[PDB]
Amino acid sequence: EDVWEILRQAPPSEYERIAFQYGVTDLRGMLKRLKGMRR
Amino acid sequence: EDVWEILRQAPPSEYERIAFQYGVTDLRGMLKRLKGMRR
Amino acid sequence: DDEETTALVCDNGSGLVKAGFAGDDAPRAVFPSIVGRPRHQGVMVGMGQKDSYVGDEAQSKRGILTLKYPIEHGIITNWDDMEKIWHHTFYNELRVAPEEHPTLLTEAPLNPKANREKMTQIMFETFNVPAMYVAIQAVLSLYASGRTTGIVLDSGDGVTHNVPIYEGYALPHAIMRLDLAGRDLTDYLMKILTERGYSFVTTAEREIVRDIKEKLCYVALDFENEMATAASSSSLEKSYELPDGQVITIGNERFRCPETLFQPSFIGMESAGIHETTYNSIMKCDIDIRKDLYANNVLSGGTTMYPGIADRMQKEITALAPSTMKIKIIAPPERKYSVWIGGSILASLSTFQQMWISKQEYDEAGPSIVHRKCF
Amino acid sequence: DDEETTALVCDNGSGLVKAGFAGDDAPRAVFPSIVGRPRHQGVMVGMGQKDSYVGDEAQSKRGILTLKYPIEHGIITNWDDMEKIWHHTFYNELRVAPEEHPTLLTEAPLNPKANREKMTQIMFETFNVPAMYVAIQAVLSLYASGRTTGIVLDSGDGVTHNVPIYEGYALPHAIMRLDLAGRDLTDYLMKILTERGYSFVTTAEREIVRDIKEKLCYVALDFENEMATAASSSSLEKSYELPDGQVITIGNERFRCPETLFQPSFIGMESAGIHETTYNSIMKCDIDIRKDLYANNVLSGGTTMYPGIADRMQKEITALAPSTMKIKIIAPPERKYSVWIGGSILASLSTFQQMWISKQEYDEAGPSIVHRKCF
Amino acid sequence: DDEETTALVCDNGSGLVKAGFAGDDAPRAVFPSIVGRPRHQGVMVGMGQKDSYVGDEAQSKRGILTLKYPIEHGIITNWDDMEKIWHHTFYNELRVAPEEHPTLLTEAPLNPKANREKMTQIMFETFNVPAMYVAIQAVLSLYASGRTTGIVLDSGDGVTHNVPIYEGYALPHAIMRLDLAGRDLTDYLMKILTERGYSFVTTAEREIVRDIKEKLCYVALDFENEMATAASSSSLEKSYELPDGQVITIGNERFRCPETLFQPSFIGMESAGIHETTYNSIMKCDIDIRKDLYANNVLSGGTTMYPGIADRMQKEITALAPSTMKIKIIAPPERKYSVWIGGSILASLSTFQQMWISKQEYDEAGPSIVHRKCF
């Protein structure tokens, strides 16, 4: 998927954007799981 | 005032003008009263 | 039953329709441009309720009936309603035979031609007036000014524009549009009243709120300083008996409602406020017309009835206009009916029948005629 | 007794209050927002009945106690009841020290500022949480969407609105209000059940009827054709055991209850149905945002759990929207808890403590601070 | 990472900025000269919206952001915006180190010297290009012609002028100015669309309308005959899907928009149309240069993309020019990018580095140098 890697690599401002383009519509998700790491 | 007399004497085209110079800013007036005569 | 005739100075004021005879001192008819649909339409012994005789009757006996403007946004979407409206006009408070008397009609700039086309032929046919004529409400108010030169901020019934002039000479390039209307401030203030812990959605609520404006709302010359006051300005908390009966409290909204006519950000229009629209129209003006414009800063509209509106003008221009030139905004107390007064004078211009839209000219030239070389 | 902290994602869902920790997969607490007054208050050996521990206990042991929402109409009229409600929350099913954990709070649009003012200081004082933060339930569900663009029909717990968006960009001018609520359909269906030869007035009857809805009531795509069916549609007469025990019969009401969310005539709201509210919000939208809106037609609400609701959307728009554009309504199965999920994610936004309503900021800036430049 | 260098042929096309390397077959970068301010600036989880990266991104994701040209009227009022614009250029679609490559710049006639002064030093400092050079877009298009002799109607991006020439020999006395621009036709056609029963005020509406032009608007060789047709010309009513989705109807405006470039009365310029400006420039020309001018009637501009524009040229001249002489208007399909092509060739003129604005020459001679004996 690389959404893990690229949404821990992309901008944050654009973490929003590119979770929404690079397949993580649940940027909601991406952050909650990024947090499951840092939650 | 003479606006009555000179706005029944002045040009008509310039009834507009000279009501607006010789004191009848209400050329609007001058005609409505000229009409109160001819209304 | 009298001599030749007297014109029918009839105004379709954006909010209310107003009219009188030629050279009358006041349009004898004025009332909202509403259409009424009784919501539940209860069945009772007999009847006595007409659908849409709204005129002035409906709002008093409002609620069941909803509200409708044929001319909703200064432009009319329905007419059957609307011609029956004029019938109410000419036979209930004009109570007159249209065929009897010539009538001048008010048409706003930017109208598609077909609008006046139809309004014409329908008035001819249904009303068979001797004949008619029409003119721009803005232009009619402008003759009501008699100020041949200068721009007019025609923020009156439900519309806003600028009318730069000189000796009666106005530039269509120099005239713009403002969708802002009493309806717009209505929506805004209703919004604010609701968000402050209130349920302001209902039609009669809409009329009530506009009245709340017209008798309460003002505008502050300064914005932030007066808003800081409102942080603790114990003057401005005048609460007004909600017409249902419970006093409705009021604070800074009593002013910060209409200023958005200068800042449409809160009302959400990219458009620029009235003042800078006037100013940029000024810039597009020629070199020295502008001093006159300053002196001919003729305001117009009862919607603009707010206190310090003119003063806010002079100050805002000052911030804009060079101090070298001197600014003089005009604003008659008789601004909303000034349009009808100018119409009465012009239609009364018995030296000016020649511009009149007659039976024949129309018939031979159909509807299109009134548009070519005439209006 | 652990590391730094995890947020307190707490929702005051209009009907039920729901909450969990930061980034929880489900709000661990959910129950009605009822207050219970035992009617006759019988005297017995000892006690064991608290007045208003309603939570989830009261309704089971309902009847004597009446029902009360502090937030009756999405807006709270009483709080003592309500803060004791949150105490029940944080110490009976949250059973946690509020001081321990940060909490994000749900506030609906159009609230008077003082509401969140107090909710804040009371939570600070009584709950002394590390600090708090609040957000619009609509907005939180909107982040729960992740759909940056498009409008959301936030007809969820007990409220209805439209939330036009683009890349997270929503217009307050483009967002409206709908007083319609599960309570409203409740009153309507209770009315109908009563008029059909039934005595449906009692509170527990109220809960029963809402349940009757949630497990039975649907909506038909077509209205008159499905009503003509009901004239003889032998399918729809499913009668359901009245929970007291006698099967309660059901017919076309199983659908024609909620459609009034499109037609408030029968419920008696001049307001227009959900669909055309969405549509006119669409028109007020810019030119081409609307295709996305069609594709971003994100529905929300478990109240909207009805079958064919989305399909009725697409068809009604179709009747409204140009066929040129393509309509795509969204509606997650997880719509009512989607708000809490978005809250959990956002509060969990450990990159986003900075927006947090802390002790000091509040104290030095009092209550007003949370409102200026923050929420 | 290669040999000596290749120039940076960069055009600040009045509407779009375009550029490529020395001797490129097409300016690889082209996009509007807009600045974007998100109107309401909604707060969401995180960010992702830059204020004014408009480039080509903004208009697609337009609406919230407004539009701004630094060079509004072919002359730039703001630059910070504008140098960040070139940064976007050189690092997003040029994505190149300006210090690496020489760049030739486009400057229009009648510019105050300080404009190119600053543009220079800022490009030196911020961009530290090896050095730069600048040239008149009109002149660059004129080398793009290769037609040493004759006048060019440089009605291209957003400006209009005449460029009489002979063997590359042009008279500044013989070159005039036309404020008319695609923006001007924009305002006019927006005006007309609005007055015909339409609300065309919004920015994205502005882009849409220009596109409506570029793909629809043409010009009729004859004016009154084609307007009489339009009275009933059932051909011209092609209605175009408003990009929001509802087909927008079109009639005679599809042509009578731009002709005002010949008649500025309706657009309200006392100035004379393009044709007679060319003609009077011709008269001021010497005796026999004029036959060549007839043959060298080189048109320029994609704004002039209209059908029959050249033919209308020949006919109007014919009405003006003596039949004794023979008129030949030129107009490449590659007229709007012809300016950039001429720039690419000239900057690519590796026999012509000597005219180059270098670090030292500038530094020792400051900004003024580039103006004396050079440009």
Side-chain angles (χ1 to χ4, degrees):
Chain A
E1 60 292 10
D2 299 333
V3 308
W4 298 84
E5 88 185 4
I6 298 168
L7 302 173
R8 70 181 189 257
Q9 169 273 326
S13 170
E14 287 65 5
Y15 277 165
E16 285 76 4
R17 304 289 64 68
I18 296 89
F20 296 153
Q21 294 89 19
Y22 280 172
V24 166
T25 184
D26 59 343
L27 179 78
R28 178 195 62 264
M30 183 278 287
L31 274 295
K32 183 178 179 180
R33 57 203 66 174
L34 188 153
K35 298 157 184 173
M37 183 278 288
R38 73 172 187 200
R39 189 177 70 189
Chain B
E1 60 292 10
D2 298 333
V3 308
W4 298 84
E5 88 185 4
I6 298 168
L7 302 173
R8 70 181 189 257
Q9 170 273 326
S13 170
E14 287 65 5
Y15 277 165
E16 285 76 4
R17 304 289 64 68
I18 296 89
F20 296 153
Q21 294 89 19
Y22 280 172
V24 166
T25 184
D26 59 343
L27 179 78
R28 178 195 62 264
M30 183 278 287
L31 274 295
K32 183 178 179 180
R33 57 203 66 174
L34 188 153
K35 298 157 184 173
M37 183 278 288
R38 73 172 187 200
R39 189 177 70 189
Chain C
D1 54 357
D2 68 339
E3 288 184 353
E4 293 179 353
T5 192
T6 184
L8 294 174
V9 59
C10 54
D11 181 3
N12 296 295
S14 70
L16 283 72
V17 178
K18 312 83 167 179
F21 264 120
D24 292 337
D25 282 331
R28 44 184 61 193
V30 182
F31 63 89
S33 306
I34 301 299
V35 178
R37 297 285 75 78
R39 185 176 179 83
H40 83 91
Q41 181 179 1
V43 177
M44 292 83 95
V45 296
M47 183 278 288
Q49 67 284 18
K50 190 272 181 183
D51 303 335
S52 191
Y53 291 168
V54 167
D56 175 76
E57 60 88 20
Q59 66 278 27
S60 54
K61 331 115 65 144
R62 81 293 181 275
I64 191 59
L65 286 71
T66 187
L67 73 85
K68 283 82 70 183
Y69 305 105
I71 193 66
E72 295 85 357
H73 64 281
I75 297 88
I76 188 167
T77 62
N78 188 359
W79 293 270
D80 47 56
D81 54 357
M82 191 45 248
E83 75 263 10
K84 296 183 289 294
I85 297 169
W86 292 272
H87 186 273
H88 181 74
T89 310
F90 293 99
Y91 311 79
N92 307 78
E93 58 283 33
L94 286 174
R95 72 277 188 194
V96 59
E99 302 67 12
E100 293 179 353
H101 295 89
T103 177
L104 164 53
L105 277 296
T106 65
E107 67 274 19
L110 291 140
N111 185 0
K113 183 146 286 193
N115 188 358
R116 56 161 173 133
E117 297 181 353
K118 64 181 144 337
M119 65 183 73
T120 299
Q121 72 272 15
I122 296 89
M123 295 299 102
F124 292 47
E125 56 198 74
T126 60
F127 293 99
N128 290 318
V129 301
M132 64 182 73
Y133 180 80
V134 301
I136 289 280
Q137 315 77 0
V139 177
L140 314 187
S141 54
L142 298 172
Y143 290 118
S145 71
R147 302 286 57 59
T148 61
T149 297
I151 190 166
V152 75
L153 169 45
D154 62 359
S155 178
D157 289 345
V159 73
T160 300
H161 294 262
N162 298 331
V163 181
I165 297 169
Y166 179 76
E167 294 302 320
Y169 296 116
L171 183 62
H173 301 184
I175 178 174
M176 187 66 204
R177 187 276 187 297
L178 183 62
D179 63 358
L180 182 55
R183 298 285 74 78
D184 291 331
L185 277 298
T186 299
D187 292 331
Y188 182 76
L189 161 73
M190 294 182 286
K191 172 214 76 69
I192 62 170
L193 294 174
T194 307
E195 51 79 20
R196 69 161 178 133
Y198 294 97
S199 176
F200 286 52
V201 343
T202 62
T203 294
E205 209 160 19
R206 285 114 103 159
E207 293 83 6
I208 297 169
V209 176
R210 72 163 180 264
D211 295 331
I212 297 165
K213 322 222 249 226
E214 284 277 358
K215 65 178 72 66
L216 277 296
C217 188
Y218 40 71
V219 177
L221 279 295
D222 59 322
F223 182 76
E224 281 55 20
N225 299 113
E226 295 294 329
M227 296 228 345
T229 64
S232 296
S233 165
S234 298
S235 62
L236 60 87
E237 294 83 10
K238 276 75 71 177
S239 173
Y240 180 74
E241 181 275 335
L242 183 63
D244 58 0
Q246 66 283 22
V247 65
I248 192 66
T249 175
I250 298 89
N252 51 1
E253 68 276 16
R254 202 171 309 140
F255 63 88
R256 59 176 182 183
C257 185
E259 83 293 18
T260 189
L261 62 84
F262 312 104
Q263 92 289 343
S265 67
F266 293 99
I267 57 170
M269 286 28 84
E270 64 159 293
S271 62
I274 69 166
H275 64 279
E276 64 285 40
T277 65
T278 71
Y279 202 61
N280 64 7
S281 57
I282 297 169
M283 275 75 70
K284 73 184 305 288
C285 295
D286 72 12
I287 295 299
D288 274 16
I289 193 66
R290 72 201 216 177
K291 17 85 140 179
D292 292 331
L293 294 174
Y294 289 16
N296 309 302
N297 291 318
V298 294
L299 179 62
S300 44
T303 300
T304 299
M305 61 79 71
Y306 293 96
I309 299 296
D311 292 331
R312 286 180 285 279
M313 295 299 102
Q314 293 83 18
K315 54 165 175 66
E316 66 206 8
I317 297 89
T318 310
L320 294 174
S323 68
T324 61
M325 284 73 74
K326 296 292 184 289
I327 203 71
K328 277 73 177 175
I329 294 88
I330 299 88
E334 171 46 0
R335 291 171 296 174
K336 181 177 285 290
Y337 293 99
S338 53
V339 298
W340 178 93
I341 304 297
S344 63
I345 68 158
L346 187 153
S348 72
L349 294 174
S350 58
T351 44
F352 293 99
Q353 287 69 240
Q354 59 292 5
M355 284 73 74
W356 186 254
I357 297 89
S358 81
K359 296 322 184 185
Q360 294 82 17
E361 60 86 20
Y362 182 76
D363 291 331
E364 286 92 10
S368 60
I369 173 171
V370 61
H371 320 279
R372 296 62 179 169
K373 198 74 173 176
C374 56
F375 318 100
Chain D
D1 54 357
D2 68 339
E3 288 184 353
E4 293 179 353
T5 192
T6 184
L8 294 174
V9 59
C10 53
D11 181 3
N12 297 294
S14 70
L16 283 72
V17 178
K18 312 83 167 179
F21 264 120
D24 292 337
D25 282 330
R28 44 184 61 192
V30 182
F31 63 89
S33 306
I34 301 299
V35 178
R37 297 285 75 78
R39 185 176 179 83
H40 83 91
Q41 181 179 1
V43 177
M44 292 83 95
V45 296
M47 183 278 288
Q49 67 284 18
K50 190 272 181 183
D51 303 335
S52 191
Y53 291 168
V54 167
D56 175 76
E57 60 88 20
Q59 66 278 27
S60 54
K61 331 115 65 144
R62 81 292 181 275
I64 191 59
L65 286 71
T66 187
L67 73 85
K68 283 82 70 183
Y69 305 105
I71 193 66
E72 295 85 357
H73 64 281
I75 297 88
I76 188 167
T77 62
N78 188 359
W79 293 270
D80 47 56
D81 54 357
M82 191 45 248
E83 75 263 10
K84 296 183 289 294
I85 297 169
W86 292 272
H87 186 273
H88 181 74
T89 310
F90 293 99
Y91 311 79
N92 307 78
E93 58 284 33
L94 286 174
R95 73 277 188 194
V96 59
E99 302 67 12
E100 293 179 353
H101 295 89
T103 177
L104 164 53
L105 277 296
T106 65
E107 67 274 19
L110 291 140
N111 185 0
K113 183 146 286 193
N115 188 358
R116 56 161 173 133
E117 297 181 353
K118 64 181 144 337
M119 64 184 73
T120 299
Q121 72 272 15
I122 297 89
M123 295 299 102
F124 292 47
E125 56 198 74
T126 60
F127 293 99
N128 290 318
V129 301
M132 64 182 73
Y133 180 80
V134 301
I136 289 280
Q137 315 77 0
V139 177
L140 314 187
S141 54
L142 298 173
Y143 290 118
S145 71
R147 302 286 57 59
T148 61
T149 297
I151 190 167
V152 75
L153 169 45
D154 62 359
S155 178
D157 289 345
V159 73
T160 300
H161 294 262
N162 298 331
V163 181
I165 297 169
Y166 179 76
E167 294 302 320
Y169 296 116
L171 183 63
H173 301 184
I175 178 174
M176 187 66 204
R177 187 276 187 297
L178 183 62
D179 63 358
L180 182 55
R183 298 285 74 78
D184 291 331
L185 277 298
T186 299
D187 292 331
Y188 182 76
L189 161 73
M190 294 182 286
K191 172 214 77 69
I192 62 170
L193 294 174
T194 307
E195 51 79 20
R196 69 161 178 133
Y198 295 97
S199 176
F200 286 52
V201 343
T202 62
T203 294
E205 209 160 19
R206 285 114 103 159
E207 293 83 6
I208 297 169
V209 176
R210 72 163 180 264
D211 295 331
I212 297 165
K213 322 222 248 226
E214 284 277 358
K215 65 178 72 66
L216 277 296
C217 188
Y218 40 71
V219 177
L221 279 295
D222 59 322
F223 182 76
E224 281 55 20
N225 299 113
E226 295 294 329
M227 296 228 345
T229 64
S232 296
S233 165
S234 298
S235 62
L236 60 87
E237 294 83 10
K238 276 75 71 177
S239 173
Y240 180 74
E241 181 275 335
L242 183 63
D244 58 0
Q246 66 283 22
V247 65
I248 192 66
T249 175
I250 298 89
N252 51 1
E253 68 276 16
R254 202 171 309 140
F255 63 88
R256 59 176 182 183
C257 185
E259 83 293 18
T260 189
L261 62 84
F262 312 103
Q263 92 289 343
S265 67
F266 293 99
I267 57 170
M269 286 28 84
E270 64 159 293
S271 62
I274 69 166
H275 64 279
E276 64 285 40
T277 65
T278 71
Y279 202 61
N280 64 7
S281 57
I282 297 169
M283 275 75 70
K284 73 184 305 288
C285 295
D286 72 12
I287 295 299
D288 274 16
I289 193 66
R290 182 182 65 198
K291 17 85 140 179
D292 291 331
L293 294 174
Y294 289 16
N296 309 303
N297 291 318
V298 294
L299 179 61
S300 44
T303 300
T304 299
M305 61 79 71
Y306 293 96
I309 299 296
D311 292 331
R312 286 180 285 279
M313 295 299 102
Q314 293 83 18
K315 54 165 175 66
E316 66 206 8
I317 297 89
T318 310
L320 294 174
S323 68
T324 61
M325 284 73 74
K326 296 292 184 289
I327 203 71
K328 277 73 177 175
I329 294 88
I330 299 88
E334 171 46 0
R335 291 171 296 173
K336 181 177 285 290
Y337 293 100
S338 52
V339 298
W340 178 93
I341 304 298
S344 63
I345 68 158
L346 188 153
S348 71
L349 294 174
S350 58
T351 43
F352 293 99
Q353 287 69 240
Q354 59 292 5
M355 284 73 74
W356 186 254
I357 296 89
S358 81
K359 296 321 184 185
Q360 294 82 17
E361 60 86 20
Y362 182 76
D363 291 331
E364 286 92 10
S368 60
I369 173 171
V370 61
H371 320 279
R372 296 62 179 169
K373 198 74 173 176
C374 56
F375 318 100
Chain E
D1 54 357
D2 68 339
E3 288 184 353
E4 293 179 353
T5 192
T6 184
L8 294 174
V9 59
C10 54
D11 181 3
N12 296 295
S14 70
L16 283 72
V17 178
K18 312 83 167 179
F21 264 120
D24 292 337
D25 282 331
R28 44 183 61 192
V30 182
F31 64 89
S33 306
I34 301 299
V35 178
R37 297 285 75 78
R39 185 176 179 83
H40 83 91
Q41 181 179 1
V43 177
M44 292 83 95
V45 296
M47 183 278 288
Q49 67 284 18
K50 190 272 181 183
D51 303 336
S52 191
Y53 291 168
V54 167
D56 175 76
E57 60 88 20
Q59 66 278 27
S60 54
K61 331 115 65 144
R62 81 293 181 275
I64 191 59
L65 286 71
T66 187
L67 73 85
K68 283 82 70 183
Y69 305 105
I71 193 66
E72 295 85 357
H73 64 281
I75 297 88
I76 188 167
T77 62
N78 188 359
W79 293 270
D80 47 56
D81 54 357
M82 191 45 248
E83 75 263 10
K84 296 183 289 294
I85 297 169
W86 292 272
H87 186 273
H88 181 74
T89 310
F90 293 99
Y91 311 79
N92 307 78
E93 58 284 33
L94 286 174
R95 72 277 188 194
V96 59
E99 302 67 12
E100 293 179 353
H101 295 89
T103 177
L104 164 53
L105 277 296
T106 65
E107 67 274 19
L110 291 140
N111 185 0
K113 183 146 286 192
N115 188 358
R116 56 161 173 133
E117 297 181 353
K118 64 181 144 337
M119 65 184 73
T120 299
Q121 72 272 15
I122 296 89
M123 295 299 102
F124 292 47
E125 56 198 74
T126 60
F127 293 99
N128 290 318
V129 301
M132 64 181 73
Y133 180 80
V134 301
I136 289 280
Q137 315 77 0
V139 177
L140 314 187
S141 54
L142 298 173
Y143 290 118
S145 71
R147 302 286 57 59
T148 61
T149 297
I151 190 166
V152 75
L153 170 45
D154 62 359
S155 178
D157 289 345
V159 73
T160 300
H161 294 262
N162 298 331
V163 181
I165 297 169
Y166 179 76
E167 294 302 320
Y169 296 116
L171 183 62
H173 301 184
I175 178 174
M176 187 66 204
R177 187 276 187 297
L178 183 62
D179 63 358
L180 182 55
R183 298 285 74 78
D184 291 331
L185 277 298
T186 299
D187 292 331
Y188 182 76
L189 161 73
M190 294 182 286
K191 172 214 77 69
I192 62 170
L193 294 174
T194 307
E195 51 78 20
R196 69 161 178 133
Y198 295 97
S199 176
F200 286 52
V201 343
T202 62
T203 294
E205 209 160 19
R206 285 114 103 159
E207 293 83 6
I208 297 169
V209 176
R210 72 163 180 264
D211 294 331
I212 297 165
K213 322 222 248 226
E214 284 277 358
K215 65 178 72 66
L216 277 296
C217 188
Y218 40 71
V219 177
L221 279 295
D222 59 322
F223 182 76
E224 281 55 20
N225 299 113
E226 295 294 329
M227 296 228 345
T229 64
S232 296
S233 165
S234 298
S235 62
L236 60 87
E237 294 83 10
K238 276 75 71 177
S239 173
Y240 179 74
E241 181 275 335
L242 183 63
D244 58 0
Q246 66 283 22
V247 65
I248 192 66
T249 175
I250 298 89
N252 51 1
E253 68 276 16
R254 202 171 309 140
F255 63 88
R256 59 176 182 183
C257 185
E259 83 293 18
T260 189
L261 62 84
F262 312 103
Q263 92 289 343
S265 67
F266 293 99
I267 57 170
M269 286 28 84
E270 62 159 293
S271 62
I274 69 166
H275 64 279
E276 64 285 40
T277 65
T278 71
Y279 202 61
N280 64 7
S281 57
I282 297 169
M283 275 75 70
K284 73 184 305 288
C285 295
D286 72 12
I287 295 299
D288 274 16
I289 193 66
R290 72 201 216 177
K291 17 85 140 179
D292 292 331
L293 295 174
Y294 289 16
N296 309 302
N297 291 318
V298 294
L299 179 62
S300 44
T303 300
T304 299
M305 61 79 71
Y306 293 96
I309 299 296
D311 292 331
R312 286 180 285 279
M313 295 299 102
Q314 293 83 18
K315 54 165 175 66
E316 66 206 8
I317 297 89
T318 310
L320 294 174
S323 68
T324 61
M325 284 73 74
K326 296 292 184 289
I327 203 71
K328 277 73 177 175
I329 294 88
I330 299 88
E334 171 46 359
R335 291 171 296 173
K336 181 177 285 290
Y337 293 99
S338 53
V339 298
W340 178 93
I341 304 298
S344 63
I345 68 158
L346 188 153
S348 71
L349 294 174
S350 58
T351 44
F352 293 99
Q353 287 69 240
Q354 58 292 5
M355 283 73 74
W356 186 254
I357 297 89
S358 81
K359 296 322 184 185
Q360 294 82 17
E361 60 86 20
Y362 182 76
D363 291 331
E364 286 92 10
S368 60
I369 173 171
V370 61
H371 320 279
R372 296 62 179 169
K373 198 74 173 176
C374 56
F375 318 100

